[PDB]
Every structure is written in C-alpha cells, then in structure tokens.
Design a protein around this ligand. Sequence first.
Ligand code: 5RP
Ligand code: 5RP
Ligand code: ZN
Ligand code: ZN
Ligand code: ZN
Ligand code: ZN
Ligand code: ZN
Ligand code: ZN
Ligand code: ZN
Ligand code: ZN
Ligand code: ZN
Ligand code: ZN
Lengths: 216, 217
Amino acid sequence: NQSSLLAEFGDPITRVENALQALREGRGVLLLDDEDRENEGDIIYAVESLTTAQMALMIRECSGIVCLCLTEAQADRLALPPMVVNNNSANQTAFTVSIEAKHGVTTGVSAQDRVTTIKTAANPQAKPEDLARPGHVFPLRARAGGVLARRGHTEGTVDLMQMAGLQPAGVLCELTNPDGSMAKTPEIIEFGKLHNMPVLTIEDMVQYRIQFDLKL
Amino acid sequence: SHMNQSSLLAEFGDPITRVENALQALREGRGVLLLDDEDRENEGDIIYAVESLTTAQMALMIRECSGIVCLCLTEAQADRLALPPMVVNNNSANQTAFTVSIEAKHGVTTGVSAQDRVTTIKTAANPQAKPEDLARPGHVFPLRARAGGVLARRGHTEGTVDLMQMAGLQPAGVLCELTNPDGSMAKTPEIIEFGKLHNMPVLTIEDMVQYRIQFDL
Ligand SMILES: O=C(CO)[C@H](O)[C@H](O)COP(=O)(O)O
Ligand SMILES: O=C(CO)[C@H](O)[C@H](O)COP(=O)(O)O
Ligand SMILES: [Zn+2]
Ligand SMILES: [Zn+2]
Ligand SMILES: [Zn+2]
Ligand SMILES: [Zn+2]
Ligand SMILES: [Zn+2]
Ligand SMILES: [Zn+2]
Ligand SMILES: [Zn+2]
Ligand SMILES: [Zn+2]
Ligand SMILES: [Zn+2]
Ligand SMILES: [Zn+2]
C-alpha cells in the first residue's frame, strides 16, 4: 500500500521538508494526489529556477501538457481569465486561456520556448501584452487557501513554493509510462529515485499545513 | 556540402509520389510525417487518421512528440460540437486555430492517458457527435482547419484535414510536433530517420500544394 511504499522517503513530515529543500535547491519534486481522486504523480518545478533541461525531462517523461500554476493575483496581472465561462471538467481544472511569449520564441513548443514563455509570464512586472494567446503553455489558477481549499496538484504546486519561501509560481506535468498509461506509486517512486526527486502526497501537505497552523 | 531539404526528401520519391505514399499509409492505418515550409515553422508533425487511431499510436505521440496532441477538424464539425475559437482575437504567430480544449464525458477518468485522449478524439470526430458529449476544458486540443485546405493556409492543420479527405477517410486527424530528447524540435534529418524507423512516409505542405494543383486544377 501507498503509505508503506512511501515509507522509504521518510515519514510524512520528512517527506514535506525534503520536498521543500529540493525546491530551494532548484530541484524538482513529485507530487501524488489522493488515491481516490486522480491517483497521479506530477513532476513539479519552481519557475524561479526552471531550466531547459528540466523542461525537456517533463516533455519526454510526462504528458507534455506542461501547466503553469499561478496565484489569482499573478493570473489577474497577466489578464488570463478562465478558458471557459462554465468549467464542467471532472476536477474543475482551472485552465486559463493558453499562452505564448509574444517576443523571444518561434513556434512555442521547444523546451527553450516553453521556458521563455513561462519566465515571461512569471516576471513580477509582467504585463498582459507580454503574452500572445492562444499558445503552448497552459496556466492554471490556484485556489485561494491552497490544499486546504482544494486537494489538487495545482494548489499543491503553489503551496509548495510558498512553503519553501519561493516565488509562488511552479510548473507541473503528469508522469506517463512509455505505453501511454499514467504512472502509479511504484513507477513514481522509481522515477524519483532515478532523478534525485523527493516524492510526497497532497495528504502529506495537508497534514503538514494543519500541524504548523500554516496560512499561506 | 549540405544538400537542401528537397534533396534529403528525394529517397521518399518526387513531390507527387510523396503525397501518394502518404495517402496510402493513411488508408492502411499508418501515420505520416508532415513538414511545413522551411521559412514557416520548419517543423515535422506526426499525423494519424482518427478513423484508425489506436492507443499505441497516441502513446507514441506522447512519448516522441510535444504531447500537445491536437484534433484537426473541419469548420462544419467544430460548429457541430459548438467549439468556438479559444480567443476572439488570436495573436499567436501563425494564428493557430485552437478551440477551447475538450474531454470526453464517458469512458475516461483524468483525460490524459493515451487511451483517454483517443476516447475523447473518437467522441469528438464522430459525425453524429453533440456538444454535450464533450466537457470543456480538457486535455485534447481541437483545431479549426481553414476552408480550402493547403491552397488557402499552409499549416499542418490544413495538411491534416486535406490528407484525410484526399485519402477518402473521415475528415479528422490528430497531429503533434516531433521533438528530440533534449527538448529541441526535430528537424528534417531526424524526421526522415524517425519516418524510416516507424514506416511512416515523409512529405511537405509544398508537396501537397503541387499535388492538389496537378491533380485538381
Ligand atoms: O489535469 C491536470 C492539468 O492539465 C493535472 O491534474 C494537474 O496536476 C492539475 O490539475 P489538478 O489541480 O486538478 O490536479
Ligand atoms: O502549433 C501547433 C499545434 O497547434 C502545430 O504547428 C500544428 O501543426 C498546428 O499549427 P499549424 O496548422 O499552424 O501548423
Ligand atoms: Zn505550430
Ligand atoms: Zn492533477
Ligand atoms: Zn502519378
Ligand atoms: Zn499517381
Ligand atoms: Zn495516379
Ligand atoms: Zn488532472
Ligand atoms: Zn504546425
Ligand atoms: Zn535508419
Ligand atoms: Zn521511435
Ligand atoms: Zn483533390
């Protein structure tokens, strides 16, 4: 079972603290959501330290739909409303209109171009005109309150950044097996071991936030 | 001396032959690799007929391409599904005609596995589909092909729908951009090798344009 498998990454508190220190060091982490929800592991990177190599790993090891998790305030600053007026997706995944850097990219899809787009979007002094729409990067609006308001990878991403003391923007993508099926805990554990990436769950995060009275 | 692209593509035949082999591969359920103009994107996209799309084919795209797998549709089919342009004022470099993204309602879970994307695509491409069959947003990205195909707009979008129509297949195909492990986009020699290894013909939009000119006009 999951809890028993994750044991080798430490106890739940250790699992959170290792994830936070990985992010501070510029490394990625792998975040599992609830078993009865998606039961998927996403690679998470802090935008602050995002490299082309990190992006390239996501593209070749994950779904390739690399999303940029943003606070409401940052999404607002960039004038990125929800893609649809009435979201009826299974998880209410908060996709905004898709984006591309207006300047400094070609087709938008290379690892370099996605990073350029993401860095442009995450710039504290970005304006809406810095991004063309539509494009190949997929921003997501994180819920105010984070994982204590919504138990998604979107909130997990942003909460991790804030908990780590980093700028509150991260990227995510779902780890996918070569045959096209989604990675499960065993494969996720293996991937984290291969790539020196801490693994943790949303429940780890929730329990950690509760214990340490963490408003973010 | 490096030969030009046309010279590299010569082993696939002359322009017309390259299109004819593409059409036949699609009729046999195999994919093709379509290059656009060198002064446009200069990118090769894997293209598959939705009619014969399998989970294995989709898995290949996720593994070997950008993973942003797009569903090229006719304007008629997009309107049938009530899929408006994602943004009213499109200012992307090529005005790539993204609609709002989609997900099938039944038969899927999170929408992102190879099998889920296929289910979603099959659902959308069905000639008797209704808007309500598709949740929005989702993990499949439809594109509105321009009326007139590659003689009107020289995009992989139009190339896909033209290819299906010319092959006599359901006028819906899926595309995705071939990518190298280091995250750079695959270029002609890599596209050609990939095509040889996967038994997928390689062709260009210009080949398709010349074929339509010579075979229709
Ligand atoms: O679907 C997704 C984005 O395309 C993934 O599930 C991603 O992890 C964010 O969604 P959520 O916050 O609902 O997990
Ligand atoms: O960006 C893309 C995905 O949408 C690809 O270039 C795809 O080929 C569609 O674009 P176009 O028709 O402009 O080539
Ligand atoms: Zn493109
Ligand atoms: Zn998720
Ligand atoms: Zn002939
Ligand atoms: Zn002939
Ligand atoms: Zn003939
Ligand atoms: Zn999801
Ligand atoms: Zn294209
Ligand atoms: Zn070879
Ligand atoms: Zn291959
Ligand atoms: Zn014709």
